[PDB]
């Protein structure tokens, strides 16, 4: 390479560490690499940002594809790649995003451990829905949709807006689709919808409409049937080309399950059948993922015109009670 | 089909359809070293080295194709002596194959691609072996994420000339002619001047005037200026001329030899 580009490029590039201040900020560590709650050295800009360096060297399959999509998605409830740095001397890569102190899984345990109030649920699903149908509709899937990933923004000009994070680019399973369950070799749109079905059951109820103790997953199968009931017939005419459909006729008996359905779940945890949440959530829940409801028709439901009418802030100008992210050792 | 409908908002269209001027401005730093012509030349040359690297490596002709919209982004802003061309080719290879969802085509796969393309195919350009390893790939790899701004997503001719057949109820006649057409754009600048959907017009355009079929009243129905479409057929007609008059095999050594070199360090 030639010595004057080369000098020239390593005098005027932006160094991380140069342009923000991160030293003891860290707010999460996983197989995804380190992630630090940073603001600019500069001082012009006030903001906290997300500062992630990625896991390993170089440019992964699953960094490129990363990189490669949140380059081009723009959605004000999908979380946005700002900026990317690139360390050449140790092959390491980080990305910028824009900072949300809060997500649903810390929210629902808050109200789990003062019910969840339902102004806010309606707020929540309907940015969950708008940002999914936007990567739908660019034919983005995001494969593994949990609280854990819906982040909602904390204090600034975008408090209380929904952030869809972690998309699939490149163990519990309560969020995933019963035919994923029998062993079908493809993510679709429909298994988005499934988990954000059970991610509205949960802001609900305060507890996973699935939960199950620690493909084919006998024990996640059963839950699903004693929440739903067992799958007629006439409402899922295909499940028997699911690849595990007779391992499922062999361990299972609709017998079993006669008198479960998402009605009596529902009315246990003081959810009227006669309400509109009700009647969305079933839509969503629907076993059969041809009979599921899409983002769209989902964000058309006339819940979302009954009053109270969801709010960009799904907070609607009151206190966060929600605490802060808390930060990590370097260890 | 990630992101095939949202060409209008893209990092493509906002940041990578460049003007004329700009280009042929940054151009004039190699053009004291190779004139005009042998520049373009050389642009179908290495345009031929790729797609002999993506055929060797068994790719998808879109997989080539983003690779060598990789390749003209880079020397479309830095001068040829940068990073040698010879390593840039298989780094743009190397990247497209991980966005492009085939996958991290194998380091020993890579290299063995490069150096077999370079001794069978082209021995008239160099006689000596590939010299580069994968620790060189590996550094010039971040050197172009940079410059193009990490910008991965690139749209092609190939889905719109294939929707625009379709319509016409033409795909048979037309189809295969159309699509080696738009492969031959590859030669020249127009991937970074025009939207793909302009260019698969022109390429149909051509087509249907080679095959003496009359498509006037097809054309006259789309809201589409005409301008820059006849722009880009000039461009195309241009290219078989320049395609008959060059002899690749017999130039390519002499026209290698005239590019800048790199500055060692001191
Ligand atoms: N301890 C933690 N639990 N949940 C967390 C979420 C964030 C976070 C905040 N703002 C913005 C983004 Cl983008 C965030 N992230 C972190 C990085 C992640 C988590 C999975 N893979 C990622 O790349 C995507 C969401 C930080 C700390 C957190």
Request: hydrophobic share 40%; net charge neutral.
């Amino acid at each position: 390479m030639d010595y004057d580009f080369k000098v020239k490029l390593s005098s005027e590039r932006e160094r991380v560490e140069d342009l923000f201040e991160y030293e003891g900020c860290k707010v999460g560590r996983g197989t995804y690499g380190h992630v630090y709650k940073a603001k600019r050295k500069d001082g012009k800009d006030d903001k906290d940002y997300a500062l992630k360096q990625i896991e390993g060297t170089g440019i992964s399959m699953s960094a490129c594809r990363e990189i490669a999509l949140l380059r081009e998605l723009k959605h004000p409830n999908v979380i946005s790649l700002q900026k990317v740095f690139l360390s050449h001397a140790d092959r390491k890569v980080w990305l910028l995003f824009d900072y949300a102190e809060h997500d649903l899984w810390h929210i629902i345990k808050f109200h789990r451990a003062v019910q969840l109030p339902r102004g806010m649920v309606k707020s929540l699903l309907y940015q969950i829905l708008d940002g999914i149908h936007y990567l739908h509709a660019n034919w983005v899937l995001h494969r593994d949709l949990k609280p854990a990933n819906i982040l909602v923004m904390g204090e600034g000009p975008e408090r209380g807006r929904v952030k869809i994070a972690d998309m699939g680019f490149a163990v519990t399973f309560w969020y995933r689709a019963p035919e994923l369950l029998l062993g079908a070799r493809h993510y679709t749109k429909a298994i988005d919808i499934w988990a954000i079905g059970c991610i509205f059951a949960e802001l609900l109820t305060s507890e996973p409409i699935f939960h199950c103790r620690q493909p084919y997953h006998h024990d996640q199968l059963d839950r699903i049937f004693n929440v739903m009931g067992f799958p007629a017939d006439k409402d899922w005419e295909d499940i028997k080309k699911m690849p595990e459909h007779s391992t499922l006729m062999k361990d299972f008996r609709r017998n079993t399950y006669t008198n479960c359905s998402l009605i009596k779940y529902m009315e246990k945890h003081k959810v009227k059948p006669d309400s509109k949440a009700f009647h969305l959530l079933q839509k969503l829940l629907t076993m059969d993922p041809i009979k599921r409801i899409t983002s769209e028709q989902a964000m058309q439901d006339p819940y979302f015109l009954e009053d109270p009418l969801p709010t960009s802030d799904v907070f609607a100008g009151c206190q966060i009670p929600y605490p802060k992210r808390e930060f990590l050792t370097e260890e | 089909k990630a992101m095939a409908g949202n060409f209008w908002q893209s990092s493509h269209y906002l940041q990578w359809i460049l003007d004329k001027q700009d280009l042929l401005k940054e151009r004039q730093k190699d053009l004291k070293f190779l004139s005009e012509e042998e520049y373009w030349k050389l642009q179908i040359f290495f345009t031929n080295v790729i797609q002999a690297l993506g055929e060797h490596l068994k790719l998808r002709q879109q997989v080539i194709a983003t690779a060598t919209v990789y390749f003209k982004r880079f020397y479309a802003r830095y001068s040829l002596k940068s990073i040698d061309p010879v390593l840039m080719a298989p780094t743009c290879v190397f990247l497209a194959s991980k966005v492009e969802e085939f996958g991290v085509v194998s380091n020993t796969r890579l290299i063995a691609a490069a150096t077999s393309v370079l001794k069978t195919r082209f021995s008239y350009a160099f006689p000596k072996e590939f010299p580069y390893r994968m620790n060189h790939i590996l550094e010039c790899e971040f050197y172009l994420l940079e410059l193009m701004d990490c910008c991965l997503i690139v749209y092609h001719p190939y889905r719109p000339l294939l929707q625009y057949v379709q319509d016409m109820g033409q795909e048979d006649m037309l189809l295969p002619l159309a699509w080696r057409i738009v492969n031959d754009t590859y030669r020249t600048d127009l991937c970074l001047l025009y939207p793909p959907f302009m260019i698969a017009l022109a390429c149909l355009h051509v087509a249907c005037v080679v095959q003496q079929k009359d498509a006037r009243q097809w054309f006259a129905e789309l809201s589409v200026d005409m301008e820059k479409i006849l722009e880009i057929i000039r461009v195309i007609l241009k290219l078989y001329e320049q395609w008959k008059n060059f002899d690749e095999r017999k130039e390519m050594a002499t026209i290698l030899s005239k590019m800048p070199k790199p500055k060692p360090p001191p």
